[PDB]
Design an enzyme around this catalytic site. Structure first.
Site, mmCIF file in Angstrom:
data_model
loop_
_atom_site.group_PDB
_atom_site.id
_atom_site.type_symbol
_atom_site.label_atom_id
_atom_site.label_comp_id
_atom_site.label_asym_id
_atom_site.label_seq_id
_atom_site.Cartn_x
_atom_site.Cartn_y
_atom_site.Cartn_z
ATOM 1 N N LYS A 202 0.785 -1.224 0.000
ATOM 2 C CA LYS A 202 0.000 0.000 0.000
ATOM 3 C C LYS A 202 0.828 1.290 0.000
ATOM 4 O O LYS A 202 0.604 2.175 0.823
ATOM 5 C CB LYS A 202 -1.001 0.001 1.162
ATOM 6 N N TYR B 147 16.529 1.871 -19.436
ATOM 7 C CA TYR B 147 16.366 2.477 -20.761
ATOM 8 C C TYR B 147 17.615 2.406 -21.611
ATOM 9 O O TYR B 147 17.558 2.071 -22.795
ATOM 10 C CB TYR B 147 16.065 3.952 -20.652
ATOM 11 N N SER C 160 1.542 4.929 2.929
ATOM 12 C CA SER C 160 0.204 5.516 2.989
ATOM 13 C C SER C 160 -0.107 6.170 4.332
ATOM 14 O O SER C 160 -0.857 7.151 4.398
ATOM 15 C CB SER C 160 -0.833 4.437 2.750
HETATM 16 FE FE LIG Z 1 9.558 4.016 -17.301
#
Ligand SMILES: [Fe+3]
Ligand SMILES: Oc1cc2cc[nH]c2cc1O
Ligand SMILES: Oc1cc2cc[nH]c2cc1O
Ligand SMILES: [Fe+3]
Length: 689
Positions: free
Chosen positions: A73, A192, A259
């Site tokens: 959570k 990436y 949370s």
């Molecule tokens: Fe991403």
């Protein structure tokens, strides 16, 4: 008095080192202190964070998702901002990058070698895979998704993959002994840039990466021309065409936190100082958004412009949106589970009494309609925005909130109007209802101009007939935002339980849920707000003319009503006067838009289809209406839709909340907002920005 340090979780040695550089430069600038915990993958920081070992970590949209899941959570505190090639944004495009002269298209990847950012990431996994689900020839959930990809791709580098059970998913990874397929910058093919090198170094034929990747690595336009992108329409376009050639547009990565007691203000104070002190070219001593060439995207996403604080209501589900969630949730559901959900229509019932009616409407429709429920109308719009519900009938006032959240009105409630009640209904130009100020004939001393300090009964806050039309008018004569002080005491469900606005409220039968904005509060709605007046709990009820009319002269036989007579009641006219309830045309506060159904512009046409059927079967003239179910009836409690609804009509052109509600009323609603604003309305300002 004092407040400690934010413990940042890191995933690899290179990442720790950078963090250390960050902790060094934070204390040297005498700004908020950080600390660095050391885990081996982002999932572990998710774990490490939920277990109060750590406090923060930037995650990719896809992991935001996983982190928001039950046992953890976690929630997105701040969203990184990016390039765009134009205006900065908190979103970005996923692309599939390939070398020129490789020949294949998006629909031919079967048997290609592929490089991925990592297991579970938006662009490196969640997005490409869901695009190739149709070519995976996959049973569905019982069978591990990784087995489908491990067979479809001849060999790939999807870090974090189970290379012991699915060797094919880790084979292309370049890594030392146990570094191979590592879920940190340990495996050079991670992230990436790693997925890009795996392509450019010829180990793979397709790279599942971000729109910027090619530009971050090949600064010279000549380099880029050796590359291309696969578009979902099975063609190829230059790397510069991402706005045109992309698989999907996901939400940016974001810093997550717990949370409860997550120390949001601590983290935010850290990052704010960090953008200001080490953001874009602020410094040279240390750069927040810069990394070592060996491993990229350490700690944050390199060359991001900064962060934006994510409003408080927003949870991961709202963070990501319908679109991203459906697709991720769709890689964990059966082909048959998916197509079922696209054909049904989930209605959001507000409170216990509506959920039951909905339940009856579900059964009787043979599940063309299913239900979802929440305690308040805002919670339902949240459901609609998360993608867990398809629609709900809203009041002119909440069409505004929904409308500000990107929701569109499908069909409008057309009450049993008066002209020629033939098939006119669905094409009858909606005409609206008049909101009025109602008081008993008796208290004849009472006039519009003497309401000050009197008790008031309100359909609810945020709603038209009540709240918006009167509060908007009084706010013009008093010039004050102290709304709780104009009326001595009031009942207006949805207000602060502890304010005067909730004083006269009553709750359900055993007096629980006082002021709750739903049927559980007996004084909620036009019905309850009139009752509030009848049972003498308040002196003026703001409701539409028809409300008095449908609850007097024995028409409503519910105890409190029964003996009511339309003569005992009069309306308060804006010019000081008082006319019988039959005079509303010349004595009302205003003419408001009829409630209307709303959904994403996505489902509005399907939503419209199912609705015409459903309402012909159980509508104002439904064959099976008295018979087995009457959609527009509920024993005066006005559940789901109003009880005087003849059918659900067309919008006569008015397709946006602006056109539908009209200019004035919209401007009238913005004017009132100068005083109070709402958490949904704000969360939606961020989300639709
Ligand atoms: Fe991403
Ligand atoms: O927010 C950050 C947290 C961790 C998780 C470890 N590396 C990180 C990346 C971050 O920028
Ligand atoms: O007045 C209305 C009646 C019911 C009861 C809870 N749902 C509804 C909301 C309203 O729009
Ligand atoms: Fe209304």
């Amino acid at each position: 008095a004092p407040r400690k340090s934010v413990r940042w979780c890191t995933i690899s040695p290179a990442e720790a080192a950078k963090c250390a550089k960050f902790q060094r430069n934070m204390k040297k600038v005498r700004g908020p202190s950080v600390s660095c915990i050391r885990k081996t993958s982002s999932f572990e920081c998710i774990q490490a964070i939920a277990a109060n070992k750590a406090d923060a970590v930037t995650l990719d949209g896809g992991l935001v998702y996983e982190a928001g899941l039950h046992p953890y959570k976690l929630r997105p505190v701040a969203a990184e901002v990016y390039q765009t090639r134009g205006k900065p944004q908190t979103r970005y495009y996923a692309v599939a990058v390939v070398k020129k002269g490789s020949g294949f298209q998006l629909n031919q990847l079967q048997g290609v070698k592929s490089c991925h950012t990592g297991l579970g990431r938006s662009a490196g996994w969640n997005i490409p895979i869901g695009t190739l689900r149709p070519y995976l020839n996959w049973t569905g959930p019982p069978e591990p998704l990784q087995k489908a990809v491990a067979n479809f791709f001849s060999a790939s580098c999807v870090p974090c993959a189970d290379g012991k059970q699915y060797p094919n998913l880790c084979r292309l990874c370049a890594g030392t002994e146990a570094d191979k397929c590592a879920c940190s910058s340990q495996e050079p093919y991670f992230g990436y840039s790693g997925a890009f090198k795996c392509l450019e170094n010829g180990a793979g034929d397709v790279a599942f990466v971000k729109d910027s990747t090619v530009f971050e690595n090949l600064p010279d336009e000549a380099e880029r021309d050796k590359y291309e992108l696969l578009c979902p329409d099975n063609t190829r376009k230059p790397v510069d065409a991402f706005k045109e050639c992309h698989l999907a547009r996901v939400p940016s990565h974001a810093v997550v936190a717990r949370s409860v007691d997550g120390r949001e203000d601590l983290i935010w104070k850290l990052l704010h100082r960090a953008q200001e002190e080490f953001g874009r070219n602020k410094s040279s001593a240390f750069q927040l958004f810069k990394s070592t060439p060996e491993e990229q995207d350490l700690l944050f996403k390199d060359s991001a412009l900064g962060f934006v604080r994510i409003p408080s209501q927003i949870d991961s589900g709202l963070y990501l949106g319908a679109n991203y969630l459906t697709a991720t949730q769709n890689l964990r559901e059966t082909a048959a589970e998916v197509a079922a959900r696209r054909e049904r229509v989930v209605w959001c019932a507000v409170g216990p009494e509506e959920e039951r009616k909905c339940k009856q409407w579900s059964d009787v429709s043979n599940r063309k309609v299913a239900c979802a429920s929440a305690s308040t109308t805002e919670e339902c719009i949240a459901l609609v925005l998360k993608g867990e519900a398809d629609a709900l009938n809203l009041d002119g006032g909440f069409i505004y909130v929904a409308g500000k959240c990107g929701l569109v009105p499908v069909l409008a409630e057309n009450q049993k109007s008066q002209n020629s009640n033939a098939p006119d209904c669905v094409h009858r130009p909606p005409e609206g209802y008049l909101a009025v100020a109602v008081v008993r004939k008796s208290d004849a001393d009472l006039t519009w101009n003497s309401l000050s300090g009197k008790k008031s009964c309100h359909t609810g806050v945020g709603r038209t007939a009540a709240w918006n039309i009167p509060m908007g008018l009084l706010f013009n004569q008093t010039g004050s935002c102290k709304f709780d002080k104009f009326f001595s005491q009031s009942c207006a469900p949805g207000a602060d339980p502890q304010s005067s606005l909730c004083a006269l409220c009553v709750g359900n039968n055993e007096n629980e849920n006082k002021c709750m904005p739903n049927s559980e509060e007996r004084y909620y709605g036009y019905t309850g707000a009139f009752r509030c007046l009848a049972e003498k709990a308040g002196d003026v009820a703001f409701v539409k003319d028809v409300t008095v009319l449908q609850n007097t002269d024995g028409k409503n036989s519910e105890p409190w009503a029964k003996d009511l007579k339309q003569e005992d009641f009069e309306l308060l006219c804006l010019d000081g006067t008082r006319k019988p309830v039959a005079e509303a045309e010349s004595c009302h506060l205003a003419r408001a838009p009829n409630h209307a159904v709303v959904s994403q512009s996505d489902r509005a046409q399907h939503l419209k289809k199912v609705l015409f059927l459903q309402q012909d079967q159980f509508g104002g003239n439904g064959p099976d209406c008295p018979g087995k179910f009457c959609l527009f009836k509920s024993e005066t409690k006005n559940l789901l839709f109003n009880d005087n609804t003849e059918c659900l009509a067309e919008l006569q052109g008015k397709t946006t909340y602006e056109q539908y509600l009209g200019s004035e009323y919209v401007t009238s609603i913005t004017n009132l907002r100068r005083c109070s604003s709402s958490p949904l309305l704000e969360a939606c300002a961020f989300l639709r920005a």
